[PDB]
Every structure is written in C-alpha cells, then in structure tokens.
Design a protein around this ligand. Structure first.
Ligand code: VRZ
Ligand code: CA
Ligand code: CL
Length: 430
C-alpha cells in the first residue's frame, strides 16, 4: 500500500486522468512510467496521474524547501529567477557529496549585487558543529530566526513552478485530425513550423516535413531514436504523424529562436552574465550529445530555442542525418569530416552570435571571402563588450587542429562558473 501526495494542483484534460489539489493523497495502483494509475483518497476516483506531480508521503520532496536533484548551478538559476528575494533558500541533494545535502541561500553583495551562496550540510545534521539538529526542518527553523554565521537570515523557500504536464499516455503516433495548426511561425526549404493545439487542450509546435529522398519508414526509425535521446536542454519530441507529409510535434518554446530573441527589445536588455548563462545551458546540451557519441552538425543561434522562462534548448538534433558555411569547421567544408569537434567550432561562432546580440558572423564579409580568410588564419576580432576570457574560449574553439579544441564538458564547466573562483564555490564557516 503505497500512498503518495500531490505537490501541485492538477486539472484533468484527458479521458481517464484524475484532477487533484495540492495535498491530496492517493493509493498507487500501477507504476507505468510518466503516468501512474492511482486512486484519490479525496474523491475515491481511479485513473491516471502524472508521476512527477506526486511524491511519497512525509518524504523530503513533500517539503516546500527541499529540491530534489538540483545542481549547484541550477540552484543559483532558480534562486536568482523572478519572484525571489534576500534570504530565499532551498535544501537540495549535494551534487559533489553524493547521499548528502546542501543549502543554497540568496544574498546581496555590494560589489556584484544579488548572489547565491552554498553551504554543505553535514550529516543528525549540522553546518557548524556548535549547532546540531535532528531534522532539516529544525535546521531550517533555526536559520529563519537569525543568521548564525550564514551570509543571510533565511526567509522564504525558493519559488517553484508546476512542472510540465507529461504527454498523453501511448500517444507517440497520432492522427493528423488531433491537430489544429493555428499559426505559421517559420518556413523553409524542407518544410514549415507552426504553433498548434493538440486535442483542444495542449499548445505545441509542429514541424511539417516536405516529401523527399528520405524513406518514410527510414525517417520514423530515426525519429524513434531521437525520442530516446532525451535531455533537459534538448527540445522534447512529443509525437509524430506517420503519414506523408510527416508532422513532428514538439514542446512549444514561447520565445522562439535565440537569434530572433537576441535581436529583440527584451533580448537587447539581457546583460552579459545572462548571455554567458544562455551559453552554458547550450554547452550543457552539447555535453549530453558529446557523451552519447552523437553529433549535431548544424549548431547556431537559429537552432536554439528560448522558453518563456529564458531556458535555452537545442533544436533539430538528429534532423541532420535524416536530411550555412559561416558556422562550419574547415575540415567539414573542405572535407566531409563532421565530428563533435566540428560542433565545437560552431559553438565558438555561436558564442560570438550571442555576445553580438544576433549579429551575423563576419559582418561585411561573404562565404568565399571567409573560406580563403580561414586558410590565412583570420579569426573574428573581439567585440567591445566581450571579456578577454570569453574571447579566448572562442579562440580555443577555433583551433585549426580539431583535436586541440576543448570538450563541451569542459566548456560547460568554464561557462557555468565563469564568475566564481573554484575556492569560492561553497562557503566556509568556523
Ligand atoms: N518548438 C518550437 N517552439 C516554438 N517555436 C519554434 C519551435 C521550433 C522548432 C524548431 C525545430 C524543430 N525541429 C525538430 O523538432 N526536429 C525533430 C526531428 C525530426 C526528424 C528527425 C530527428 C529530429 C521543431 C520545432 C521553431 N520555432 C520557431 C519557428 C521559426 C524560428 C523558431
Ligand atoms: Ca570554499
Ligand atoms: Cl483505499
């Protein structure tokens, strides 16, 4: 008898799913992935619930101040996000001390401004040996009273938001009838992208594929492989229409491409640390692809999408094998050689795009002028607002020898902690 509890309100939208309120308890009947069959103790109704909307009773995830699986960097992002304030905090799983916890607190430093500081929690629990606690709630309650050595007196738990409704169960292949393609967002050589609604309840994006040398079944086995290479920083693939012309249904990214977003009013107001953060998020996506021994092949700001929350995700991963030289590595233009190192070059160019708020690479120059200038050994100069250290990241991406370009694993780690000395990752306290 496994009782779980709702962490958020959920409104039912399908045939057999349950509505519930935050706090409602339920018996688990079946653990079938993203959807679980449950019985609500509040309503007595049996049906399906999103497994990520609930957690086991009295376990830590039920706590408003606990955040499961959040990294140090993502803790910073959450705590710095709109709606928080001085002393805003969270307790979370320790990224580097497996099995243990860490505390992240929002602070203000005169020189830099808003910041997040991190304290290791020592397992009974303590941060300093002079203050020991049986529970984390005890721990939380003490530092709410006064800063006992901490950078800031604890105030309010970090703002959380409802996670995304998972896709309808068993709905990978859907009939075209379930869609209304309401607004053409983009159009090109290989098809179109539309804002769309699925079965009157869910906003999505649909990429329409023009018929081609691609074999129908060959195209689907490829898409079915991409659906397994899921990651937070890769556009989620939701569904497919298997009948020509092929529709690919993905999550809707409310702010469009990074390219268009940066060239916008709201984009041009993004200060430099934001842009680097965007870069780090993309690099994290590319680090996943790198680990999986895959390749993207078409990295640039037009193939990065931005969510309403300013989360950047990589789009069109995989479309390259199923089917703009100013972003391409020499050994890939002059030869056929595309590797992850060619993506690294492309990332460097992307890095420039970001810092130049969308400006086209090599402005004034053109494709043949560029290819010849590459064989010289020309590289784009450092823009006025780009820090020297960010620039030499780009330069390292632009080595002629592909094997001398750094990994995305390393790039991500440098961009993530760009403003933080390694020794200052965690705080010390007597
Ligand atoms: N998801 C979105 N949400 C909101 N706006 C979006 C988009 C997209 C978008 C971009 C790329 C893709 N590509 C894609 O899903 N490829 C999946 C695939 C297909 C076959 C094989 C492997 C992978 C889908 C949607 C594009 N756009 C805008 C339309 C023009 C610029 C951005
Ligand atoms: Ca330290
Ligand atoms: Cl019961």
């Amino acid at each position: 008898r496994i009782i779980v509890v709702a962490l958020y309100d959920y409104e039912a939208i399908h045939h057999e799913d349950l509505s519930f309120q935050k706090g409602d308890q339920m018996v688990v009947l079946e653990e079938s992935g993203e959807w679980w069959k449950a019985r609500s103790l509040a309503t007595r109704k049996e049906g399906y619930i999103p497994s990520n909307y609930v957690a086991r009773v009295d376990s830590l995830e039920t706590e408003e101040w606990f955040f499961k699986g959040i990294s140090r960097k993502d803790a910073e992002r959450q705590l710095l996000a709109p709606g928080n304030m001085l002393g805003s905090f969270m307790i979370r799983d320790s990224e580097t001390t497996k099995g243990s916890y860490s505390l992240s607190v929002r602070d203000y430093d005169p020189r830099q401004g808003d910041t997040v500081k991190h304290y290791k929690i020592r397992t009974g629990f303590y941060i300093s040996p002079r203050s020991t606690f049986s529970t984390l709630q005890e721990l939380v309650d003490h530092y709410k009273k006064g800063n006992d050595g901490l950078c800031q007196k604890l105030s309010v738990p970090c703002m959380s938001s409802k996670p995304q409704k998972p896709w309808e169960k068993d709905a990978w292949e859907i009939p075209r009838e379930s869609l209304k393609l309401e607004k053409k967002l983009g159009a090109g050589q290989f098809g179109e992208v539309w804002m769309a609604t699925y079965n009157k309840h869910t906003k999505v994006a649909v990429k329409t594929m023009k018929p081609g040398s691609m074999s129908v079944e060959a195209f689907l086995a490829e898409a079915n492989v991409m659906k397994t290479l899921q990651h937070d920083k890769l556009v989620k693939l939701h569904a497919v229409v298997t009948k020509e012309p092929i529709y690919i249904i993905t999550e809707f990214m409310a702010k469009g491409s990074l390219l268009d977003f940066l060239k916008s009013d709201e984009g041009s107001k993004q200060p430099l640390p934001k842009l680097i953060d965007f870069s780090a998020q993309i690099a994290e996506g590319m680090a996943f692809i790198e680990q999986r021994n895959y390749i993207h092949r078409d990295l640039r700001a037009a193939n990065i999408l931005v969510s309403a929350s300013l989360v950047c995700k990589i789009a069109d991963f995989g479309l390259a094998r199923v089917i703009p030289i100013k972003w391409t590595a020499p050994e890939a233009i002059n030869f056929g050689s595309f590797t992850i190192k060619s993506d690294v070059w492309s990332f460097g160019i992307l890095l420039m795009e970001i810092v130049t708020y969308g400006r086209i690479p090599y402005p004034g120059m053109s494709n043949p002028e560029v290819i010849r200038a590459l064989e010289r050994g020309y590289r784009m100069p450092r823009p006025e607002n780009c820090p020297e250290e960010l620039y030499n990241i780009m330069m390292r991406c632009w080595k002629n020898r592909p094997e001398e370009r750094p990994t995305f694993e390393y790039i991500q780690s440098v961009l993530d902690d760009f403003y933080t000395a390694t020794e200052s990752q965690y705080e010390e306290i007597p």
